Design a protein around this ligand. Structure first.
Ligand SMILES: Cc1cccc2c1C(=O)N(c1cc(-c3ccccc3)ccc1O)C2=O
Ligand SMILES: Cc1cccc2c1C(=O)N(c1cc(-c3ccccc3)ccc1O)C2=O
Ligand SMILES: O=c1ccn([C@H]2C[C@H](O)[C@@H](COP(=O)(O)O)O2)c(=O)[nH]1
Ligand SMILES: O=c1ccn([C@H]2C[C@H](O)[C@@H](COP(=O)(O)O)O2)c(=O)[nH]1
Lengths: 313, 313
């Protein structure tokens, strides 16, 4: 089945992974250096054995593809995937007054979880309808939108890294320099989250576009399914714009890990039986992906087992 | 045998690789996305089935480790691996007078090869003994020494990327952010050679340092053996400085390819039988690798079959 390599990865870290301390003081079981392939000709790698909301994937990737870094666009699609990072600079700012919000994400795991959900609703509506607030606390800064489409240069300017590589694929498809990078040595030592999706690379041979992601670290239970779909989607999108058929998505990992408190959740999922893979439908009559909207992308026959509970990693 | 994964890679591209046009107008047989592992506890991955001069590896890696970008240091060790790039800016410069040196590297493949070797001897001695010349034509600029140790920042400064990551490994060994990057989006669109060794990543779990290289494109016959040894050496060196034992070197590839005119050479080599792996000896009494000299690194029991002829890729 198309998602088997995901299920083998979970199972490999289960059986032969070693205990590794981590930055968050959860325990992990970890392996270093791993590689999965997904043949995109065969269908779309949205796990069927655990629900992954494709609406969430596509709205975030479109956020990225527009060069957007403000939570507002996500919110207008009720995509709450980055909310907690924006909240960070609201709570801790010289403009915040309210109840205690230190360790917010950490201590929300049982009575605090009630007032927290309260301030987060006040923060979301405010970002939605208060432009100056949005500008100050809604904008994430150095997230994948700027890195891909507005990369800051030593000379004061800004480089459209992904735009330029697409023209390269169009014009020199056989080039082995088709790299988009999210890793800025000037920025990583002090940034909130150095990008886990460090670098990707396009490849064209005989009508097919492929992509390989180098992911420096991977939460197997929560992150990976979402990460497979984002970058498999991007492969399709870029193929679509270049008039190419779709090849493989290759997921390469640095530290691929299972958090200690996701062990039961993973055992639950491994006893589930993969269902026929959904198929991706892209707008046949629109090709300029930076101008893509939600309706331009549709998934057919997605048939997941339910979502599985977590504690957040 | 320790080098089997190299021999399987050659054999995989032989049997299931597809013909791909390239930048140099040679033909290639190519595959996209590949991953080899070398257990460094088992011995040193210097191919025995084809001679790889370790002297050349170590002098180049020391060049890098010092932040050096001038051909002069290489030359003092009779390391001619980068000469042709420096020559480039001499021949084509507003200071060159002599016989025709256009396409120099390309047309040197039968009577031209005599006068070319002549100007290259005049260029090498000149760089060796003429400091101002050395400064103008000996210095390569944006090669791995600056990228690793003097990375230029938007604010006019220069970042010691590799120095800083070593302190990180020392101080936060379990960090999943131990990345050194050679890929600068500001520089790649106009540079002579965008680095093939795009990015590497360190990993520590239970006393062992590992490293993974993301190599964007790989000449299997000429480049790869040299590339395995460079980065396996760096793994040992960094382990040595951090007081760690050695784990795995993981070589990950974008476009791993066999040039069309290296097919016989590769078939010759596959009929050779791997010999017991050499063992690496590092100075037990010196640990600061940026202060390492040639004598600080020794290889024991290296026992290669002869070198194999080529046309240069
Ligand atoms: C990089 C970055 C930055 C901020 C915030 C998130 C991420 C991120 O990667 N994710 C994420 C969430 C889920 C998830 C899983 C179950 C339920 C809800 C969300 C799954 C995969 C993910 O990668 C973030 O929420
Ligand atoms: C990146 C870069 C830049 C300039 C110049 C060289 C390289 C390079 O990688 N090499 C190289 C040479 C040989 C080689 C093979 C047989 C004989 C002599 C040399 C093997 C592997 C190599 O990677 C360069 O010469
Ligand atoms: O898109 C993402 C973003 C984050 N992570 C996970 C990996 C790590 O568990 C954690 C990041 O922590 P560090 O690697 O930066 O330490 O989040 C993912 O898996 N995918
Ligand atoms: O250290 C190196 C440097 C270069 N190459 C090879 C790969 C390609 O065949 C060629 C570089 O050409 P491009 O990938 O930039 O097109 O040199 C290597 O294998 N290893």
């Amino acid at each position: 089945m198309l998602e088997q390599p995901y299920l083998d990865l979970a199972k490999k870290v289960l059986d032969e992974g070693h205990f590794k301390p981590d930055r968050t003081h959860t325990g992990t079981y970890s392996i270093f250096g791993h590689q999965m392939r997904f043949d995109l000709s065969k269908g779309f790698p949205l796990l069927t054995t655990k629900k992954v909301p494709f609406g969430l994937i596509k709205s975030e990737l479109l956020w990225f593809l527009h060069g957007d870094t403000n939570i507002r666009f996500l919110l207008q699609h009720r995509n709450h995937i980055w909310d907690e990072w924006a909240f960070e600079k609201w709570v801790k700012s010289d403009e915040y007054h309210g109840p205690d919000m230190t360790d917010f994400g950490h201590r929300s795991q049982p009575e605090f979880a009630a007032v927290y959900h309260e301030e987060m609703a006040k923060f979301d509506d405010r970002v939605l309808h208060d432009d100056a607030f949005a500008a100050k606390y809604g904008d994430l800064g150095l997230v994948y939108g700027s890195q891909w489409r507005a990369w800051h240069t030593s000379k004061g300017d800004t480089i459209d890294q992904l735009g330029d590589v697409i023209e390269q694929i169009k014009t020199h498809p056989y080039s082995r320099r088709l790299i988009v990078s999210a890793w800025n040595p000037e920025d990583v030592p002090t940034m909130a989250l150095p990008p886990c999706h460090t670098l990707y690379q396009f490849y064209v041979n005989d009508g097919k576009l492929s992509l390989q992601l180098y992911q420096r670290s991977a939460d197997i239970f929560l992150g990976v399914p979402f990460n497979i779909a984002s970058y498999a989607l991007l492969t399709h999108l870029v193929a679509h714009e270049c008039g190419l058929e779709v090849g493989e998505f290759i997921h390469t990992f640095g530290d691929a890990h299972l958090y200690v408190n996701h062990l039961d959740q993973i055992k639950e999922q491994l006893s589930r039986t993969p269902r026929p893979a959904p198929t991706l439908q892209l707008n046949p009559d629109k090709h300029d992906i930076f101008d893509f909207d939600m309706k331009d992308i549709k998934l057919l026959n997605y048939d997941p087992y339910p979502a599985i509970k977590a504690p957040v990693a």
